[PDB]
Design a protein around this ligand. Sequence first.
Ligand SMILES: Cc1cc2nc3c(=O)[nH]c(=O)nc-3n(C[C@H](O)[C@H](O)[C@H](O)COP(=O)(O)OP(=O)(O)OC[C@H]3O[C@@H](n4cnc5c(N)ncnc54)[C@H](O)[C@@H]3O)c2cc1C
Ligand SMILES: CCCCCCCCCCCCCCCC(=O)O
Length: 578
Amino acid sequence: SASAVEDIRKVLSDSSSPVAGQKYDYILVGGGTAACVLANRLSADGSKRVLVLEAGPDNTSRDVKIPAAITRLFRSPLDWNLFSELQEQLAERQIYMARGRLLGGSSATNATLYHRGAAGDYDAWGVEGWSSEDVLSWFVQAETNADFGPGAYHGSGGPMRVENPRYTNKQLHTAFFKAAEEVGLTPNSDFNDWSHDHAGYGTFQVMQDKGTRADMYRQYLKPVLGRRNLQVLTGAAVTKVNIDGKAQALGVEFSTDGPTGERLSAELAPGGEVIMCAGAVHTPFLLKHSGVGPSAELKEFGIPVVSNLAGVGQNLQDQPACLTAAPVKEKYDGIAISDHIGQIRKRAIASYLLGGRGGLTSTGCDRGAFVRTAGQALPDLQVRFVPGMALDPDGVSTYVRFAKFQSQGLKWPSGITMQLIACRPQSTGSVGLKSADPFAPPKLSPGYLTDKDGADLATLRKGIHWARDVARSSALSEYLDGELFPGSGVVSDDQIDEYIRRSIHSSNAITGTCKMGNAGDSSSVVDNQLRVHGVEGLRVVDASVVPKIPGGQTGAPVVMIAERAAALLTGKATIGAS
Ligand SMILES: Cc1cc2nc3c(=O)[nH]c(=O)nc-3n(C[C@H](O)[C@H](O)[C@H](O)COP(=O)(O)OP(=O)(O)OC[C@H]3O[C@@H](n4cnc5c(N)ncnc54)[C@H](O)[C@@H]3O)c2cc1C
Ligand SMILES: CCCCCCCCCCCCCCCC(=O)O
C-alpha cells in the first residue's frame, strides 16, 4: 500500500500480460479470414472462452472500407511485404506476394470477387467427407445476395455479403462482352451456379455491401466483438505452438512489441484446442517452428521434431498472371478517367459515400471470363477485364503506381487491360524456413511455370493469343488505339514466353501448404477432421488446408471451410463416417 508498489507491480505488471491467469478452450493463431469466422462461431454459445492472436492492427482504415483504395493497400504497412526467392526459371526475380496483416487478414486486402469455382474442383480432392455434394450446403450458409434468394446454389440469411458490383457505368464493359461474343463461341455464364459449365464470359460478383468492402472482420467479428466470451488480441505476433509419447498442444507462445520479446504463453483449458489460421503462407511457417514439419528442414535450424510431416510448406498453389493492355483512340474517358485528373475527383467522392456508391466502388477486374485454352476438363484460364490501361506488365505494381498518382499526375493514358490467370495451375511452390528466427520472413518460392509438361506456360501463352483475338474483335477494335502493351514487338511463341516470365505476377490466391488428406495420405498434414496428424489438440482452419486449388479466387472457399469446421467443432455437424 505504497505509491511505488501501487504502481511498479500493480497497474504495470497486471497490464504486462493480457493472458496471465487464464485458461482458454480455443486459441486462434491469426485474426485473418477463417479466424474471423471461427471467432464468431465458437464464441456464440456462451460457454467456450475463445482467444484470437493477430499480429496486425485492427482494421479501422478508410483504405480498407473503400475498395478502390486496394491500390494504396499494396506495398503498405497493412501488407506483410513478402518477397519470394530468386526464381531461376523466371529470369532472376523476386516475386511480390501480397498478404494482409490486419484483423480480417487478406479479406481486408482483397480484390473482393466472389468465387466458389466448379463442382469438379472439390470432387478432385481426397474426398473422405469433402465432395462437391458435401460442401455446397456450407457455401450457402452465409451467402446473402442481390442475385436470387431461394437458389440451390445461393442462400440468404448468413453474414457474408455478396452483390453485383455497384460501378458499371461503362461502354467498355459492354464492348468486352460483345468482343467475347464474337472471337469464337464463348457463351454467357453466371458463375458459382454449378448447373452452369463455368467456362464463359460474364460479371464476377463482389464481396461488398452496397459498395463498401464486406471483409470478414466487418461481417463476422466486428458485431460479435465485446462478448465476455471473446478476447481479441491485436498486435500479437505468434512464435510457436507449445507441445506435449503423445504430443499434445498446450497453447501458444506470442509477443506484443515483437523481437524485444517477453514471450507470453496462452494456456489451454482441459478441453482442446489450438487452431491455426495464419494463412497458406504463415501457418506452415509457424508449424515448422512449433516442430511440426519435414525433418532435416527442421534439423537445419535446430528445432525439436514433433510429428515429422513432409507435407507442411509443400504443395503451394498460387495461380500466376500476365497482362495485355491498350489505349483508346480519342475517347479519353474511364475508368482511370472516371475518378482521376492529374488528381482525385470530385463527383466520385460524392458518388461513393452518400450516393448509394458509384465508380470508386471498384475494384478493377470485376468482369471477365473462364476459358478452356486446349479443351481441358475444366477452364484453365481466367480472364480479368479492367476498363483502365495498365502502365506496367505486372498488374500488381500498376495498382501501386496508380496509388502513387496524385498531384504529380499528368493524365493516366486511358484504355483497357486484360489480365490472364492460370486458374487451375499444374506447377507448385513451397514455403520454408530461412533462419531459426520466428520474426524473420518465411522464405517463399511460388514455383510459377514449374510443372514438367510446361502446361502453365502454355495456358498463359494461349491466354495472350486469346486476348489479342478479343482486342481485334469488331466491337473492341472500334475503341482501341491498337499496338497493345506486350508490344507488337512480341510475336513468336518464344517471344511471348519471354514476356510472361519477365512480367509474371500473382493473382493472389495461395493455397495447399497444409493439405487435408484421408487415411494413409503420405503428403497430407491434416486428416478428414482438419486435425494435424502428429499432435493432439491442434488443427488448421485455413486456406492452407485446400488439397487442389479451385477455379476462381480463394476467399469464398476459405469462408466455408471455416463455417463447416466451426459447425463440426460445436457439435452441429459431422464429417465422414463414424
Ligand atoms: C491482393 C489479394 C487479392 C485477393 N483478391 C481476392 C478476390 O478478389 N476474391 C477472392 O475470393 N479472394 C481473393 N484473395 C484471397 C483471399 O483474400 C484469401 O485467399 C483468404 O483471405 C485467405 O484466408 P486466410 O484464412 O488464409 O486468411 P489470411 O487473411 O491470409 O489470414 C492470415 C492472418 O494471420 C495473421 N498472422 C500471420 N502470421 C501470424 C503470426 N505469426 N501470429 C499472429 N498472427 C499472424 C496475419 O496478420 C493475417 O491477418 C486475395 C488475396 C490477396 C492477397
Ligand atoms: C482501378 C484502377 C484502374 C487503372 C489501372 C489499370 C488496371 C491495372 C491492370 C489490371 C490487373 C489487375 C491486377 C490486380 C491483382 C489483384 O487485385 O490481386
